[PDB]
Amino acid sequence: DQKLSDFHAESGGCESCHKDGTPSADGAFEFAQCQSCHGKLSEMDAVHKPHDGNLVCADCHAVHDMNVGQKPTCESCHDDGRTSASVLKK
Ligand code: HEC
Ligand code: HEC
Ligand code: HEC
Ligand code: HEC
């Protein structure tokens, strides 16, 4: 296993996401960095799209905590048992 943060740091350092390699308080800088490479939520799949304007990437992708390949789940914010699968293949 590799954390997602470590995977990215191999290709650009901690500074790929963080000013001077140091986290911001707000997370806005980091969100802007994610979007600079990956684009906007509105241009992503059905899991991503309805979160445009209400979440930042880090609200689901806890890049230091989560392995490469590990999918965020949904129960922290929704109470119906939805999954990425139940929405992608709605
Ligand atoms: C983007 C893919 C990242 C890479 C590369 C690294 N980090 Fe990160 N880290 C990222 C986010 C989105 C966040 C949360 C939001 C924010 O404001 O940063 C974090 C958080 C941290 C923190 C914790 C901050 C806090 O608790 O106050 C630290 C200390 C941190 N990140 C350090 C760090 C280092 C040393 C990295 C290189 C090895 C590194 N991060 C890479 C996203 C990303
Ligand atoms: C450009 C310098 C990037 C920044 C900044 C961030 N990401 Fe990234 N990410 C980038 C590449 C080139 C790749 C590899 C291709 C791939 O899609 O694997 C990635 C990968 C991810 C992944 C994994 C996707 C997968 O293969 O299943 C995720 C989930 C991801 N990146 C998320 C993400 C977030 C939340 C960021 C900000 C905290 C972020 N990336 C920054 C390039 C770049
Ligand atoms: C929770 C509502 C999420 C937010 C906000 C973001 N992502 Fe996400 N991402 C999430 C899941 C559950 C998954 C796996 C299922 C899927 O829809 O593919 C992903 C996956 C990605 C990937 C890989 C996509 C692929 O085609 O394999 C990437 C690169 C990714 N996510 C990046 C990403 C970025 C950069 C975000 C902010 C703009 C972002 N995600 C938000 C869940 C959630
Ligand atoms: C909190 C940090 C969230 C997580 C984790 C996930 N979602 Fe979410 N979602 C969130 C907000 C703030 C909103 C805006 C509307 C609302 O519920 O208040 C959404 C919206 C959706 C939607 C649109 C339909 C609806 O329920 O309103 C979908 C289809 C959706 N979210 C799916 C989804 C999935 C599949 C998640 C797990 C991968 C997920 N969300 C996580 C906040 C948050």
Contact 31, 14 (CB under 8 A): no
Phi and psi at residue 67, in whole multiples of 5°? Answer: -65, 150
Domain 1-90 has CATH 1.10.1130.10: yes
Rounded CA separation 83/17 (Å): 28
- The answer to whether 49 is a known ligand-binding residue is no
Confirm whether residue 90 is marked as ligand binding.
no
Resolution in A: 1.0
Solved by what technique? X-ray
Phi-psi region of 42 (alpha: psi -120 to 50; beta: other; left: phi over 0): alpha
Among protein residues, the one with the nearest Cα to ligand 1's atom 23 is 23
Six-digit token string for 9? 């740091």
Taking the domains of the chain in order of start, what are their residue ranges?
1-90
Q: How far is the CA of 46 from the centre of ligand 3 (A)?
A: 10
Judged on CB neighbours under 10 Å (0-12, 13-18, 19+), 88 is exposed
Distance in angstroms (rounded) separating the CA atoms of residues 33 and 28: 9
- Per DSSP, the three-state class of 67 is strand
C-alpha 50 – ligand 4 centre gap (Å): 7
Phi, psi of 27 (to 5 degrees): 80, 0
* CA distance linking residue 41 with residue 1, whole number of Å: 27
